[PDB]
Amino acid sequence: VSRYVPDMGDLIWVDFHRPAVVLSPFMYNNKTGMCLCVPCTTQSKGYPFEVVLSGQERDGVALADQVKSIAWRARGATKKGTVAPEELQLIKAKINVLIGL
Amino acid sequence: VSRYVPDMGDLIWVDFDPTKGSAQAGHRPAVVLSPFMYNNKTGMCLCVPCTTQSKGYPFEVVLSGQERDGVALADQVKSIAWRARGATKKGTVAPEELQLIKAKINVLIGL
């Protein structure tokens, strides 16, 4: 048996309430046992860094400014789903504006 | 008195414990990525942690000082409530260092 390894764009749950969208690629994720992801939530505040996620349900706002490196392997990540490509690009475009990357 | 507000490129201590010294035994400093108006308004910043000892890991960016050299772990970018956690300024990174860090984050994402 092999544990789920998060891939770019994946929507995941981890231990340690809310889901997260994975920014970093499978290769990095699998190598490090870490990934860069942004948390999702229920409440939308019209905050400029929110990205609307079209799966509705529980966490349909991605908080693109809250990029976090997390230990997904140690925290038991599981896959909830995957964001649309356009949702992932929006998340990156908001980060891009933040970091200046 | 008003608090130190991290600015982009600052190297900061997070959760500064004045008992652990300037050594801050057990902690790591961080290079602040996000710009000042963002840090100031939100109480948050994106930063990447630093350590003194290079592990030869691919996303390490060398940080060159006078006395000691260190590394920024560019892949570890982290959003931090600096206002809640009491950031202090340890220094600032060369514009070239910031660029290298951003360039590395850009590959990982990639933006």
Q: How far from each other are the two terminal CA atoms of chain A, in whole angstroms?
A: 38
Residue A8 CA to residue A12 CA, distance in Å, equals 11
Give the structural domain span for B51.
1-111
Q: What is the resolution of this structure in A?
A: 2.3
Domain CATH code at residue A8: 2.30.30.110
Yes or no, beta carbons of A65 and B34 under 8 Å apart: yes
User: Which residue in B38, B78, B111 is closest to A101 by CB distance?
Assistant: B111
Q: Which two three-digit tokens encode residue B80?
A: 């931090």
Q: Where are the beta strands (DSSP E) in chain A?
A: 10-13, 19-22, 35-41, 50-52, 61-63, 68-70, 78-82
Residue B7 CA to residue A89 CA, distance in Å, equals 26
Residue B48 CA to residue A82 CA, distance in Å, equals 26
DSSP B74: G
**A68, A81 in Cβ contact below 8 A?**
no
Residue A35 CA to residue B67 CA, distance in Å, equals 33
Label residue B15 exposed, middle or buried (CB < 10 Å: 0-12, 13-18, 19+): middle
**B32, B10 in Cβ contact below 8 A?**
yes
- Sequence-separated (6 or more) residues with CB below 8 Å from residue B66: none
Structural domains in chain A (count): 1
Q: Which two three-digit tokens encode residue A13?
A: 């749950």
